[PDB]
Write a structure and sequence with these properties.
The structure is cut from a larger assembly and holds 2 copies of chain A, 1 copy of chain B and 2 copies of chain C.
Chain A (H helix, E strand, L loop, with lengths): L2 H5 L7 H4 L17 E7 L1 E3 L7 E5 L6 E12 L10 H5 L2 E6 L2 E7 H10 L5 H9 L10 E7 L22 E6 L9 E2 L2 E2 L7 E11 L1 H9 L2 E3 L2 E9 L10 E5 L5 E10 L45 E8 L2 E2 L4 E2 H12 L8 E5 L13 E2 L6 E7 L1 E4 L4 H4 L6 E3 L7 E9 L2 E4 L2 E4 L4
Parallel strand pairs in A: 22-23
Antiparallel strand pairs in A: 1-11, 2-3, 3-8, 4-7, 4-11, 5-6, 5-8, 9-10, 12-25, 13-24, 14-21, 15-19, 15-20, 15-24, 16-17, 16-18, 16-21, 25-26
Chain B lengths: L26 H4 L45
Chain C lengths: L32 E2 L4 E5 L2 E5 L7 E3 L11 E5 L12 E2 L13 E3 L1 E3 L2 E10 L16 E13 L3 E9 L6 E7 L7 E6 L20 E7 L2 E9 L13 E5 L4 E6 L14 E12 H8 L3
Antiparallel strand pairs in C: 1-8, 2-3, 3-4, 5-12, 6-9, 7-9, 8-9, 9-10, 10-11, 11-18, 12-17, 13-14, 14-15, 15-18, 16-17
The chains are: A alpha+beta, B little secondary structure, C mainly beta.
PDB class: viral protein
Keywords: nucleocytoplasmic large DNA viruses (NCLDVs), chlorovirus, minor capsid protein, virus, viral protein
Entry title: Near-atomic structure of five-fold averaged PBCV-1 capsid
């Protein structure tokens, strides 16, 4: 009576559902695993820590494999609420991973902001904000210990952990470049803030120490890891003024099979600004009041979702001079692509086109082999920058082919490509199997 | 071995409604205590402590702290 | 790794009308129940010891037939040009001789009749002992089954199985280690002319004409083969090699091609082999088998 | 042009990606399952329902397995919007799981809040709150039905569903303790609310009805299930307002393979409060205006994200007299560990340290088995509660080691351990494989 | 066009291939057993270092007219035998391997487009029906020859083989399925062996043995539905099986695939009888 009344109602149309059952949902079996323990210790930083300086962190061989790495910065505010925007990862300007004397990849200030913008997309990006930025309207003088997790190929999943028990003759180092200008801590815009103290930096590395039986195998057998790289060269935008619509052809100097291309349009002096400024709430400093300035962002709200303030009208990607797909408007790459491949929201001004079915995961699922493409380009068409940013009625009520006049400040073009390589581990040395 | 009111005899049916059993559980109910007395004395140091058998040589100072050997050493 | 607990493989194989059909007339089925990791089977004082080290180790009637090895099936999937023991896909990880590093999928049994479903492994691991490279994963994609069916009459039918998408090589049906204490080696010819007792050479290879085999030191084990595949569907001149080797303690072989055919491909289906074994004094074995 | 461009541009590195294919993404083969139906069936409750009263349910065999038990309440407000904070969880004070007469598990009001704080943090925390709290600024007298899904080992995934047909000779029952005080329903702060009606409650059990061939196997075959348990005893702290950065070393009493430890510093009067009260928005009643009272929270906003209002400066776990990892500051366990281990937001004041790669999951991934060690101690260093809770300039503007003078109210130390055990079911009777 | 008015006449026999493709001339020989396919028509020679005819060979044919034993009107044939030279027969594939040819042959109407006697039924010289042949020569001297017919929604009479033997076959002998002894009866020189006949042999001195292997039958319930086979043993040798010898309107034939397997082999009359007696 009830569940039974449905249970017995078995026929022909559910034979292909429950005939000759192979699985059940009501008795799961858990696969036993090699024992291990998670240990997290402090690495030594060689060099002077400070703004604009460079230090080298030497990873010790205290455990057998390396998994998660988190870099701490202790600093204070130089301003009121809303004057900062992820200063922790602006400070962590560049991180370069070197294994045995050769480089793997290099992660840039805005890459960290981009990955967070277009892959870490659920409430975890609030958690991330809490780790890297000021969230609770903190005031001048407040002190906070920031955590900037690194997002290298092995920093999210244990399956690609660095087998340092194998790599006994070739060390792994982390090279850190720190920003000389951090918004709201040392400079407000370009205006230096007096009394800005230097940060305290610490690099924490999570070691896996595992059972002697598999530990011994790790130390002796060769390995091949599905190591992933990030490749990057910065470029320049061709943003128009008014009555004229610009376009430009960027040559994509990428190699090795990719998962996606991700690009943003940046104001060089306002970290994280991918959109134009407008006199609307959250778009510029003082927005909505008589003191509103559309040349200075509301730093804490720098990232917005109003693509009307986007500069990009349309784009298409070419391979060997042939179009990959027909022209799409900028809103396609901002809203449709992250939806079809990842399932989150990408802030305005940041764009992605995927090749992989699951670019968020690490199981290969479709790649563009740029090593076999002799001429790859990205063709960008811009919005006409004719809207008067100072008039709320002008930015909130205009058409799709135009943008704010303040968009002309987005002079830096940053195009990233995420690609595959093979990390080969053999008799104490590790390195990258392909280089193109 | 049973009083009559207990049940109708099961025969000539096979719905598989009821279980067969011994009607008593003990150690497998409560659960096996893995600690024993092994944590009264201690191995705070990490190397495994070689065992000297608890031979109860003296009649007055026997003790009951168990061998306490680590199941698998670090090596 | 290459020594990972297990792996998966995909093989693409297509053909049209260039494949003969070898009728695997023998097959296997089960009605038994899942057991754990050991069998002890007895009937008529004939015991079978099936340890966790691998499922067939010893047997006898207050005696043993070896100290070290029981029966195993295997393959020589590719023997490019008659080369050495490069790819033996044994059911026993005899390279270790202590851990059974062989994945077992199902172990059904009932009293008197155990079965088996297991994968095989590459006997040589990854070490290229020849001039060619061997394989990748230690555990291969071929599965085997067994049924050891004891019949009230005091006889047991031993079924083994092999399968692979394609092979044009040499199969190993049973690798057996019968003790050296079997002085008399004797077999009957299918022409029923006589029992061909011969021990002067101690080099016995019983070819197609050999009907049934027996060995004893006056206490005997009988061997009577029943079913093996053949291209008996249309009887082409396609190769179907069936023979025994008794130059070693004992081995049963089956071969499809002399390392390579002219231009012929392979069914890729299931292969089967049903052999009847039975035990008793020299008299009982001879008296029973002489019934046929 | 189009897709054929990349397919012909095939290379050598691709042997690691698309050479000798093993799988495809465009031909999914589905596994056929065993026929079943799910039904929500009301079970009876023994005991007088009311505040401070205890009740129990002896769960009948309506079906084959139990997949999900949800407790529900009918409650009325004793106050206006903002006077409540997860009152359904405060009311469901103790839930005890008994299978055959012996305790298998027991969960607490505060644990439900802790689990929700840690693990259930996406859109599900909002829908969870919709089930357990008042979310639409409801006024005095509003009535709604509340649902409190239980989270024992058989409620989180159908693969751990409790087979009753496998346990015919043991009773399966739940005990419920109903809190004598529920904030915003019976008491406003510490004062009784006149006209507070007693609650109405029902315990719904969702049964699995599965077909005969598998049902027979369930009854006839023995089973072993890998199950979760919650270990818990509460303690107290001594957070100073002045003269010392106090330390505390609390001896832990845990056994069995532990997946993680989690803890908070609660207010024994204000349910779910893990941070200090302050005259800043959402931090106390009337915050931001002259009527602000810093001794009473703005209950609907009890949970916050400002670690400045926490009392924990640092912690480490010491095993057998030796530190298993080096000291971390308190914000580490509130933000970094759940980032690595869970992937969501943890509200301030709730802390976790994992032993596992994926403690949010069901399958074992690293444990600390406390049954083999001699001394498990959690070492805490506290913040000095020496800034003015009523002055935003101080609450939003100070250093890492100091917190609000009101923070000392967080005197309840709640340390939880989540562990594995094995449930053994044989011949219609069950129990635990191991028990200490 | 029919629904469920046909019995299960189960064609247990079927033919398949494991051979390769070749062009337009085939000669197969092994252990003195040879077949000659000159592409004038599929089979012109057979035997073991002997021949049986010069101009006629093995073929399969149909008798589509069931008007109570009428004359040769609706005879679909495998060979353009009347011309006896111009092989105006479309062949689908000509396969071979060692000792084993295979062929798929599209049949033709024997009489052509003209009527004969009184009536006819013909839409063109070439017909849609495909016959199959397989000749597997076994190294022991036994050769298995299979034939095939497939005619949808039929009620007909099929001729399994037609072959012409040499006049040098004076001794006729057949074995009755009682296996009591071989029946040496040659006084008629025309033997019609029905169900009771098991195997036959013919010889002037060295013999050709015949042993049937498989023929379609309704063996699901063994109904009384007409399933009759016979030999026509005269100088010319035909093997046939009737399903609808008359105009049957009450019950039809499924019209699916039907094949026949016959085991042919050669050797001394003694060896032929001994080979069968042993089985």
């Amino acid at each position: 009576a009830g569940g039974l009344s449905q249970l017995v109602a078995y026929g022909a149309q559910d034979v292909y559902l429950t005939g000759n059952p192979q699985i059940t949902f009501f008795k799961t079996v858990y696969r036993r695993y090699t024992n291990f323990a998670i240990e997290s210790i402090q690495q030594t930083i060689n060099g002077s820590v400070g703004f604009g300086n460079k230090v080298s962190t030497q990873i010790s061989r205290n455990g057998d494999l390396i998994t998660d790495i988190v870099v701490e910065f202790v600093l204070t505010k130089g301003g009121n609420g809303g004057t900062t925007y992820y200063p922790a990862e602006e400070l962590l300007q560049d991180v370069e991973l070197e294994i045995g004397g050769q480089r793997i990849d290099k992660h840039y200030n805005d890459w960290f902001r981009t990955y967070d913008a277009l892959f870490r997309m659920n409430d975890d990006r609030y958690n991330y904000r809490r780790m890297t930025d000021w969230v609770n309207n903190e005031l001048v003088g407040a002190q906070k210990r920031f955590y900037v997790p690194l997002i290298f190929f092995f920093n999210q999943t244990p399956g690609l952990a660095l087998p340092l028990i194998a790599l006994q003759y070739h060390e792994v180092k982390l090279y850190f470049t720190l920003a000389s200008q951090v918004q709201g801590v040392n400079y407000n815009g370009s205006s230096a803030i007096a009394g800005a103290a230097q940060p305290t930096m610490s690099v924490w590395v999570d070691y896996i120490f595992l059972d002697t039986q598999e530990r011994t195998r790790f130390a002796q057998l060769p390995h091949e890891y599905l190591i992933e790289q990030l490749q990057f060269t910065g470029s320049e935008t061709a943003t128009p003024s008014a009555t004229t619509q610009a376009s430009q052809n960027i040559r994509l100097n990428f190699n090795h099979p990719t998962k996606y291309l991700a690009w943003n349009f940046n104001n060089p002096t306002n970290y994280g600004q991918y959109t134009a400024l407008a006199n609307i709430p959250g778009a510029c400093s003082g927005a909505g009041t008589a003191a509103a300035t559309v040349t200075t962002p509301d730093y804490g709200n720098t990232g917005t979702y109003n693509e009307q303030l986007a500069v990009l009208d349309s784009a298409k990607i070419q391979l060997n001079g042939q179009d990959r797909f027909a022209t799409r408007k900028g809103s396609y790459f901002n809203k449709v692509q992250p939806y079809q491949s990842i399932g989150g929201v990408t802030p305005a001004g940041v764009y992605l086109y995927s090749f992989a079915l699951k670019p968020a995961g690490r199981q290969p699922s479709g790649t563009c082999n740029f090593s076999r493409i002799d001429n790859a380009t990205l063709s960008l068409t811009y919005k006409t920058c004719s809207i008067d940013a100072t008039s709320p009625a002008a930015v909130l009520g205009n058409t799709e082919t135009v943008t704010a006049n303040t968009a002309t400040l987005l002079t830096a073009l940053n195009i990233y490509a995420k690609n595959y390589n093979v990390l080969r581990i053999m008799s104490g040395m590790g390195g990258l199997a392909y280089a193109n | 071995p049973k009083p009559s009111p207990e049940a109708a005899d099961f025969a000539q049916f096979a719905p598989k409604n009821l279980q067969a059993q011994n009607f008593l559980t003990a150690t497998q109910w409560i659960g096996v205590n893995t600690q024993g007395s092994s944590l009264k004395n201690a191995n705070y140091d990490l190397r495994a402590d070689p065992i000297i058998p608890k031979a109860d040589v003296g009649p007055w100072m026997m003790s009951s702290v168990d061998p306490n050997i680590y199941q698998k050493p670090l090596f | 790794k290459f020594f990972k607990n297990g792996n998966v493989m995909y093989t693409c194989n297509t053909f049209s009308l260039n494949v003969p059909v070898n009728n695997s007339i023998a097959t296997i089925d089960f009605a038994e129940h899942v057991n754990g990791a050991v069998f002890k089977i007895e009937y008529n004082r004939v015991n079978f010891i099936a340890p966790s080290l691998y499922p067939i180790s010893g047997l006898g009637t207050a005696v043993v037939f070896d100290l070290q090895k029981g029966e195993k099936a295997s393959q020589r999937k590719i023997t490019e040009f008659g080369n050495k023991d490069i790819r033996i896909a044994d059911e026993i990880s005899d390279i270790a001789a202590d851990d059974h590093s062989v994945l077992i999928t199902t172990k059904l049994m009932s009293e008197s009749t155990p079965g088996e479903l297991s994968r095989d492994v590459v006997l040589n691991g990854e070490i290229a002992t020849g001039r060619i490279n061997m394989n990748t994963g230690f555990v291969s994609d071929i599965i085997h089954t067994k049924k050891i069916s004891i019949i009230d009459d005091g006889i047991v039918d031993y079924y083994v199985k092999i399968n692979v998408p394609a092979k044009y090589s040499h199969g190993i049906v049973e690798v057996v280690s019968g003790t050296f204490l079997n002085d008399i080696m004797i077999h009957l010819v299918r022409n029923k002319n006589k029992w061909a007792l011969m021990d002067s050479k101690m080099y016995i290879v019983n070819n197609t004409n050999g009907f049934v085999i027996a060995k004893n030191p006056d206490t005997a084990m009988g061997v009577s083969l029943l079913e093996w595949p053949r291209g008996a569907v249309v009887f082409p001149p396609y190769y179907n090699f069936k023979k025994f080797k008794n130059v070693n303690k004992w081995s049963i072989s089956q071969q499809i091609a002399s390392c390579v055919n002219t231009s012929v491909k392979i069914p890729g289906g299931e292969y089967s082999w049903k052999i009847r074994l039975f035990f008793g004094p020299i008299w009982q074995v001879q008296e029973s088998i002489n019934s046929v």
